[PDB]
Amino acid sequence: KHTVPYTISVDGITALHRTYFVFPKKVLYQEIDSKVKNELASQRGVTTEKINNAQTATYTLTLNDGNKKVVNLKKNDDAKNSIDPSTIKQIQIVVK
Amino acid sequence: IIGGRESRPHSRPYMAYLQIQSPAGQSRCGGFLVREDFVLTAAHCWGSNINVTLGAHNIQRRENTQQHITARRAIRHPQYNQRTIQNDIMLLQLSRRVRRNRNVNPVALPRAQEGLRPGTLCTVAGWGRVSMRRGTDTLREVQLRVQRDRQCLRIFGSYDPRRQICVGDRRERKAAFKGDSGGPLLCNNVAHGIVSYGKSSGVPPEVFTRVSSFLPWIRTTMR
Structure with missing residues (x-):
């Protein structure tokens, strides 16, 4: 299993638990988009409407080799590209 | 910290370490013992299996003072608001009462x-x-x-x-x-x-x- 810490900030507030995703295989960015939106919903009550109307709604992947990738949660043109989650160090999620 | x-x-000795199961991973929180059978924590720490470690100092070591107890029942405040994080309080009923001693006390x-x-x-x-x-x-x-x-x-x-x-x-x-x-x-x-x-x-x-x-x-x- 591969563990990936992530942080959620919504409307300038970050709850101070420590949260991780656990991955087993390769995935499309759209699957990470879904995991992120699912946690936005289940942790902070964020709806599709909230995301779509927000000033900013993104997640940033930091890879183990230091590269960062910013993904727009409103429209991700890279949804269909793949990534091996074992290369992911952590994920920063920001809405508003 | x-x-x-x-x-x-x-x-x-009241400090608790919480391990929480979520749908796509896990979370970690603190908490604190308030009665031999109850731990207080934050409602945003709720999940679908919660384990409580009492008596710990180094949580990565197997210390003989540690007591590992599953939460029987996790009771979030009924007015908890996940959006604003208001009324962020939760009681965990422990599956068994603690062994009260110098290392575990409310x-x-x-x-x-x-x-x-x-x-x-x-x-x-x-x-x-x-x-x-x-x-x-x-x-x-x-x-x-x-x-x-x-x-x-x-x-x-x-x-x-x-x-x-x-x-x-x-x-x-x-x-x-x-x-x-x-x-x-x-x-x-x-x-x-x-x-x-x-x-x-x-x-x-x-x-x-x-x-x-x-x-x-x-x-x-x-x-």
Whole structure:
């Protein structure tokens, strides 16, 4: 299993638990988009409407080799590209 | 804990370490024992299996003082609001009562509606991260100053001084941080607060649940 810490900030507030995703295989960015939106919903009550109307709604992947990738949660043109989650160090999620 | 020091082992025998199952991973929180069968924590720490470790100092080692107990029942406050993180308090009923001893003992709660003046120095403890790059295997603690409500009203639009506490001088690198949620704010050996939320940066002030605003619910739920 591969563990990936992530942080959620919504409307300038970050709850101070420590949260991780656990991955087993390769995935499309759209699957990470879904995991992120699912946690936005289940942790902070964020709806599709909230995301779509927000000033900013993104997640940033930091890879183990230091590269960062910013993904727009409103429209991700890279949804269909793949990534091996074992290369992911952590994920920063920001809405508003 | 940002900016703190290692706690003296077993000096805070009410401290609990929580391991929480979620649909796509796991979470980690603090908590604190309030009766031999109940731990208080934050409602945002709820999940679909919760394990409680009491008696710990180094949570990554197998210490014979540790007691590992599953939560039988996890009771979030009925008015918990995940969007604004209001009423962020939860009781865990333990599957078995603890073995009370020098290493595992409950902490005192405040009196009903007890206040906490701006300027009061308090202590928070936990096993959370200590910076953006490192964590801790051992319990750490830091002293923070209660702030005037004005400070958090300006930073956090949903802050409510009737049910929350504004904690931490922005000018010091001292704060509760990721993984410290649910741990206590101790002021003169009484748990007045529960670590709730702040900024991803870790820069204070931070917001704590005001325990004394929830004593009727705490008492009813434990009865």
